[model samples]
Target: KSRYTTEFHELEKIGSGEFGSVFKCVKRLDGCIYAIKRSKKPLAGSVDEQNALREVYAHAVLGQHSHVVRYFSAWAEDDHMLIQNEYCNGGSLADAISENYRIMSYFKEAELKDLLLQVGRGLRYIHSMSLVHMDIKPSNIFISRKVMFKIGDLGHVTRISSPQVEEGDSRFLANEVLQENYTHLPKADIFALALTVVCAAGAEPLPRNGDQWHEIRQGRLPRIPQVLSQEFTELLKVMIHPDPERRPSAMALVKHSVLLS
Candidate 1:
């Protein structure tokens, strides 16, 4: 019998990524359904794979919660590993943002706040586990028919621990250790999460110019549009702060007036 025989029936290709494609599938045994992330090869050999596994392990230890995605199980196929997870029929936040951008003025203030709150809660749960999801772009968040948002793609996550040593570290002073040039930390996740929130709030998080990438590399906070809320304006400031130490922790963000109120 096929390893997946008991669980799911391949439905159709729903999405694709760098490693492989994801399929919409239905559970044959329980009549439940999910999305199956199928990679062409075991992710074990790639740094991305290690990062994803770390996310899986961290979440597994952290247990299931309403805001977080649920992992069903993992199986190995001929040359790939298939990870089964909860399906989000509402699709990704990227699609939502794109649709909203087409008619930005139509988005209601309450609607935007509701969405950001959900995303913030999800980030809070991830950080509570002591894991930082380095990549928290709109594409990484999915919504379901129930109107719940779930964060996905654990491939860029890292644990908060001792400062990572790098060749350039010796040249920098200890006071500058928390600068943007430094490596991974919990605040890194906050920075990314803040960017996503700002994007969701109907503003570009970074400058839309050729030098934008270079500006980000130099630790410059992107210019946010004027229509955003004063609270959000402050939140964005904390999110993209040049000094990671100055960024609020996930728990602090959950209680922040912008998110909580």
Candidate 2:
């Protein structure tokens, strides 16, 4: 604890989620900056600890990439798991959109297509590693000062080959498989990616209501918004087609017209 405080000067609380809170901190020794994710207290003999251990193991095995958040180190302190990693000063894409929605409206179609291409490339890399990032929302995608986008938040990630066992079955399982009517498969990430990109591309996420979300998840096509381009509009239709097998693979998506530069 003393070493952490001495080595990394606490800066500001950056964000929080269901798992824990993230902080922006600076290393005193090298003056380098990083993000610290601190988990809340784990229950006695709880599965939470085991889940955290799994995440740490997966991160260590997957390691770093320009599109993936870098994992530095992790430690267990009194009732908390502390994870340190590289910091992205540009913040999450969700925040960027909220703060500059109007500004984004000024971007040309070509520019938007480029941004979507980068996102597809990143998603393709993650899929190549046989890892499914269950959470693929804008809030989980961070941007760097150099304007590069990196996928963050692996707490909900599951191994591609892992079986879709029952809850608490000790086997790697999809986090929202039951709730979102998703099959435990790599294509599930593709579905999420489609939803995220479409919404970011000026289209609303499907199923405005619970009934609609379920229907949309079941392959029912909702009316397309008038604001989206025909290419992107059709792309979303194919990507989110409820049936996981019917969804386009990441590689296929890379070749999508909406994503092509």
Candidate 3:
């Protein structure tokens, strides 16, 4: 019997990433929903295989957590292998932001407050495990049916022992990666988390379409209209501070009054 065929049924294409394509599927035995990412065929012993294995190892190490997407299993399907993840039927935070913003609607401050706390808790878990999620943004966050946000997409995850400051997309990078020649640290993730929060608040990104790396290097953020509360604004200020040292760690940010409240 085919490992995936007898147990699961592919529903439809729901998401995609640079590394692989994701599909919404359901378990035939239990009717449980799941999201599966399938990678293109890589040679048996190739750099791509190593990178794919890295993702597998990262998720296994993370194990199970309330705020982190739960990993189910992996099985080879033809030339590709499927990575089964918890199906967040409610979609992503970015989807929420886009739909609401398009209709001139927005999540209430109270609603967003809880969501931020959820993301913070997830970040704390990842950092506590000594892993840095180089990619923390609205698009990478999933919303569950329970109304909580869980951090997903761990392909860029790294450990402090072999820390690598991700180099790409200056928009969500810490100033250090953007400025200094570049930490036991997830400050860059913190900075990216801050940007995700700003996006959650319905604010446009600074430098517009991320064309202003020059502006970001100088510590300029989005326009940040009067939409966000002063307390939240201050929180944003510290997280995106030009100096990485000035930015609070993910654990520390979770303790901030903004999230603690």
Candidate 4:
């Protein structure tokens, strides 16, 4: 019996990532909905296999956290790995930001701060486990059905002590990673996380080779609009500091005054 058929009733493709596509599925036993990610390539003797297993290991070992997406199970079918993750009906942060853009809207300062805090809480847990979420972008963050923010996409996660350096979405990537000159640490994730928050606040990144792009890579983040308080702006500035060492740890960010206020 095919596990895919017997275990889950494939609904439809709901999402896609760089290495896989996500299908909304229903587990046969519980009849619960899940987001099942299936590798686009056969895993045997392929680079995809390593990353696939890494994702599974990362999610499985980390277990559960309030702001981290829940992992159900994983299995191999026809040489492809299938990972079942919790389904978020509310969709991703990227979708929310896009919706806000279309309606000529943006997150209020407090709203953005709340999101940052939730994501930071998630990162604090992941980093506490000595894992770095290499992918921390808007799309990688999902809104739970209850409207809580949760971090997803474990495909790029790596051990902080012995990381396999990988670049994230350029727009949200850290300057050190962009310059290819730094150790991979939780701080790297913080940089991307801060940029993601900034993006949520309507700061679209300028194109590469542009002055804004160059300035950002040099550790100069675009100023948050004056509407936001200086403390919040300063918080963003430190999070995106060019030097990873200077960036606050996930725990520090979670306890930040900006989030507290």
Which should have the higher lDDT, number 1 or number 2? 2
* Candidate achieving higher TM-score, 3 or 4: 4
Estimate, for each residue in 12-119, the C-alpha lDDT of model 2 and write its tens digit: 999887779889999888998999988876776666655575567658668777877888988877767799988999998777766656665533456456556667
Candidate 4 per-residue lDDT over residues 1-261, each given as its tens digit: 889889899998998757678899999899899998887555477656666667878976799898999998888778577788999888899999899889988888989899999999999999999899988999999998636999998878888877766666677777677676546578989988888888889886534455677687667767655288888888888888877888899999988877985
Q: Residue 245 deviation, candidate 4, in Å?
A: 1.7
* Tens digits of lDDT, candidate 3, 163-259: 6444534567665664534453577777787777777777775443344755654555566543668887777777777778888877777787777
Best candidate (score: lDDT): 4
CA lDDT, every model vs. true structure: 0.66, 0.68, 0.76, 0.83
Error of 3 at 65 (Å): 0.8
lDDT, candidate 4, equals 0.83
TM-score of candidate 2 on Cα atoms, chains taken together: 0.82
Q: In model 3, what are the clashing residue pairs, if there are any?
A: none
Regions of candidate 1 where Cα sits further than 4 Å from its true position: 102-107, 162-184, 204-210, 214-226
TM-scores of the candidates are: 0.80, 0.82, 0.89, 0.91
Q: Model 1: per-residue lDDT, tens digit, 1-261?
A: 667655678998889968689889999877777988888654566655565576566656656867777777877777777889899888788888788778764335555666667777777887777665656677878888838888887665555563222211111112133344445366666666666666666666454335664455355545645477666666666666767778787777767776664
RMSD of each: 5.1, 4.4, 2.5, 2.1
Q: C-alpha displacement of 112 in model 2, angstroms?
A: 4.1
